[PDB]
Amino acid sequence: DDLMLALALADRADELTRVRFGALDLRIDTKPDLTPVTDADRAVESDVRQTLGRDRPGDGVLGEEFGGSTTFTGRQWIVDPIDGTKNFVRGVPVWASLIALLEDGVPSVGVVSAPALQRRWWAARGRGAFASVDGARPHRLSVSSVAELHSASLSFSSLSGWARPGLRERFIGLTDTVWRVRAYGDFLSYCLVAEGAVDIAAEPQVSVWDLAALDIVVREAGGRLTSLDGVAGPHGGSAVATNGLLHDEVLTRLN
Amino acid sequence: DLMLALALADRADELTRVRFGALDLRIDTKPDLTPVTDADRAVESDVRQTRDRPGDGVLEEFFTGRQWIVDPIDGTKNFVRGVPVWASLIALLEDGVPSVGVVSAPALQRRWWAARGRGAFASVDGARPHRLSVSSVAELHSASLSFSSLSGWARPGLRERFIGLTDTVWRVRAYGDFLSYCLVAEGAVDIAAEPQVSVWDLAALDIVVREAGGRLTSLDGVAGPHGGSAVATNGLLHDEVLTRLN
Ligand SMILES: N[C@H](COP(=O)(O)O)Cc1c[nH]cn1
Ligand SMILES: N[C@H](CO)Cc1c[nH]c[nH+]1
Ligand SMILES: [Zn+2]
Ligand SMILES: [Zn+2]
Ligand SMILES: [Zn+2]
Ligand SMILES: [Zn+2]
Structure with a gap:
């Protein structure tokens, strides 16, 4: 197979x-x-x-x-x-x-x-x-069971990608609210979400080649992966991966 | 020993x-x-x-x-x-x-x-x-930086300055904690920085960075592990990094 x-x-x-x-x-x-x-x-x-x-x-x-x-x-x-x-x-x-x-x-x-x-x-x-x-x-x-943003661990890539002066402030804001912030970068952030070692991974510009394998791994681990606009899957141009429980709150704070 | x-x-x-x-x-x-x-x-x-x-x-524990x-x-x-x-x-x-x-x-x-x-x-x-051995990167616009988290940079002006620094360098990650400094020593990263870090957390790193040919100082440019903050670099980038943060 x-x-x-x-x-x-x-x-x-x-x-x-x-x-x-x-x-x-x-x-x-x-x-x-x-x-x-x-x-x-x-x-x-x-x-x-x-x-x-x-x-x-x-x-x-x-x-x-x-x-x-x-x-x-x-x-x-x-x-x-x-x-x-x-x-x-x-x-x-x-x-x-x-x-x-x-x-x-x-x-x-x-x-x-x-x-x-x-x-x-x-x-x-x-x-x-x-x-x-x-x-x-x-x-x-399996993804983590972390339900509250104040208790969540986030991993990102770099601050520069968050281009829009308002989205950057919003993202910087998100980092202030969560319990733990790192930027292991690239694929690692998403694999860590899938492992349930991290609760949120976010990238503001990311291609379908870079997301495709991640989408299935996140989902089969129990997680959710969407664009910044909340469109499910790898074609969005941006990706937010979470344990699911945190997803709507994350997306809300970012929009 | x-x-x-x-x-x-x-x-x-x-x-x-x-x-x-x-x-x-x-x-x-x-x-x-x-x-x-x-x-x-x-x-x-x-x-x-x-x-x-x-x-x-x-x-640190006892x-x-x-x-x-x-x-x-x-x-x-x-x-x-x-x-x-x-x-x-x-x-x-x-x-x-x-x-x-x-x-x-x-x-x-x-x-x-x-x-x-x-x-x-x-x-x-x-x-x-x-x-x-540390890297030979001489220009900030070509440097790779690793930090820990943004929240530590408490002072509203120091945060803006640090955010600035991240905008100017070539690459930014946050591998965090000891890793950032070890990467500097390896020459895989050119700058590591944390705004609040204890002597227990810096002591091993000070010697490793320096024997690799780099420099490790407080944000105020005090050499060594007692400074309460740390910036490690390949040496060549050190003064420029400190200047941009002050
Ligand atoms: N830094 C990446 C460019 O090189 P590569 O696609 O050959 O890794 C862009 C990237 C991919 N995922 C996250 N960022
Ligand atoms: N951050 C990775 C977590 O598996 C391990 C690592 C980072 N850099 C070198 N090794
Ligand atoms: Zn490639
Ligand atoms: Zn790629
Ligand atoms: Zn530490
Ligand atoms: Zn410690």
Whole structure:
């Protein structure tokens, strides 16, 4: 089945990314040469496309690095080989491959694979969400039971993205009200929500390649993921993930 | 002295790993800090007990000559929620100047250490140690910054200034607590800053940052761990960072 293949693709991407991460010349003195990450990002995409072309010939593929059909029909794989390239290039291990199958534009299978954090998160529709640490036996994920905002832990990415001068004030406001604030960034915030270690994750601009695997993992863990406008799923352009209980309050404070 | 510190961390790692694993992670309100206070006390007691170096003093749970300073669990608010960003900080101070430091985060499978004049190192999953050096980033507009949370920056003007700083740098995260500083020492980040931080929380970090070639000061530019706040950088960026915050 489809989950088994997605997990296999992540195993393969992990081999490709691990070696390249290790190979990086980490000496730096200005904004980093994104070049070797673009190389690695392209290499892993090409390899996933080649495997997909063989082993599920029918299904479409959309790639962040190379491209795919712009519309969203039938079975379609969506792949971001390295989410967190800006960490990758600095030697910061917060980066992952995101591999997701969409059925008529609805995420049905998700894998987030972060070999340099020795972690994987995955989910298939109606089958639950899971995580492994250092390849050890998988644990079923569930969101937290935190019902009050004043008791909630939030993780974000960076303050700059919250562009609108009012939305920034509103978001800064939200950080003042919650119990705990960090910014683990990118995919990590959302996986932590799914794990129930964090209660809220928010990003003001985020693409479908970056959200697709997360949407299914969050949901199968019991959580909710929507745009800032409350539209469910990965196509919103922004994402707020919560344990569900907190969702409407979070969205209300942000609007 | 260094060998002893690394040994104390090995022992603290055994105590902390088991207790982190043992935690009941179901939660619906602010977390019961109780099991972390228990673990914190347990590790401190066991370090106090560990004996060899009987002459030396010991100072978070329970500044003359040889004094050990120990925070057994930095990042207790992570520990209690199941977030693996937490560590033991073990440091030796000589007349109030850090000479030996170990940061051990077994849940991240990482350790960072330094002794005066001997350099700074890190291990990942017990694999062969690497010598650390800070980055060579000279321009603020190209710098990566990591902090803790925004609320700590209390003063309405200092907050605006800090928010400003985040707007100007190339990359902003908040990995939090000890992690930000260790990343500076690794050269993976160029600036780390916290507006309220205790000597127990900075002592191991001061030596690690400096042996890696960086600088660590208060927000008022007082060098070392006693300043009540900390800014660590690769050195090159230090004065510009302090100036923008003052
Ligand atoms: N920093 C990201 C650019 O690189 P990448 O897509 O190759 O990781 C943008 C991003 C993705 N998720 C969160 N932010
Ligand atoms: N924050 C991650 C939580 O799994 C671990 C980490 C961050 N940086 C390095 N390691
Ligand atoms: Zn990418
Ligand atoms: Zn991406
Ligand atoms: Zn502390
Ligand atoms: Zn701390």
